[PDB]
């Protein structure tokens, strides 16, 4: 499976940004899509996850008021694979939010650890400046 993301762009403080995550080679609806942030002053941090199957999402308390996650309807390629995309929107950007943002694929369809980010996209840089 493979994941790719929207390219890096510069934003003003308070601006919104939307990051796409196109996927292929696996069934989109079978796995959770995770979003994870890394910054130099914080290290890795979860922004929560969304299930394309039910539309349910679990947002981390830090991001509940600033992050919205949505998904596209999957388009099949083979009986066992499909294409589709997840999107994340961040509002009220601050300089503290600068860093690399990653899209990642859930680990299992069942069991205790289904949402773990087994596959990661390359990730892209978000920059904030006035």
């Amino acid at each position: 499976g493979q994941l790719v993301q929207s390219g890096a762009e510069l934003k003003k403080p308070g601006a919104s940004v939307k990051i796409s995550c196109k996927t292929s080679g696996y069934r989109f609806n079978f796995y959770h899509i995770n979003w994870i942030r890394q910054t130099a002053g914080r290290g890795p941090e979860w922004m929560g996850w969304i299930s394309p199957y039910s539309g349910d999402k679990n947002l981390a308390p830090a991001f509940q008021d600033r992050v919205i996650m949505t998904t596209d309807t999957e388009v099949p390629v083979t009986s066992f694979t499909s294409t589709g995309a997840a999107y994340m929107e961040i509002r009220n950007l601050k300089f503290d939010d600068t860093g690399t943002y990653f899209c990642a694929k859930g680990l299992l369809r069942d069991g205790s650890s289904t949402w773990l980010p087994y596959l990661w996209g390359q990730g892209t840089l978000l920059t904030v400046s006035s």
Partner: protein
């Protein structure tokens, strides 16, 4: 709360094991037209018995789930149990081992015959 017939087909293999009885039941239940109906009835019987013939030979008859003494060969699949039971449908799994299905069946039959031979000998020694 049942998913209905084949409702589990899209489920993971582990989840699907919950519904085996749904599929097991109705295998028998679900003039030009008259002959076609007769052929349909005979065919359904042959279909049902084909699988039962294998189970009786394997010693698995009367059971929905039957453990055996035949070791798994990594060449049939190198997947871990989590990769199989929690990440696959049975439809996907059958394709992965489609070339080995008959090989496995013969190994099960050989193991059953040796087991019964040994059980008899253990009783003869008593």
């Amino acid at each position: 709360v049942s998913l209905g017939f084949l409702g589990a087909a899209g489920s993971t293999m582990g989840a699907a094991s919950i519904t085996l009885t749904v599929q097991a039941r109705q295998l028998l239940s679900g003039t030009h037209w008259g002959i076609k109906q007769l052929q349909a009835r005979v065919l359904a019987v042959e279909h049902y018995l084909r699988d039962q013939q294998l189970l009786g030979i394997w010693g698995c008859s009367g059971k929905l789930i039957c453990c055996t003494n035949v070791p798994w060969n990594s060449s049939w699949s190198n997947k871990s149990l989590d990769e199989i039971w929690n990440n696959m449908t049975w439809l996907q799994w059958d394709k992965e081992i489609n070339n080995y299905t008959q090989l496995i069946y013969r190994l099960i039959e050989e193991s059953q015959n040796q087991q019964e031979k040994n059980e008899k000998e253990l009783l003869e020694l008593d």
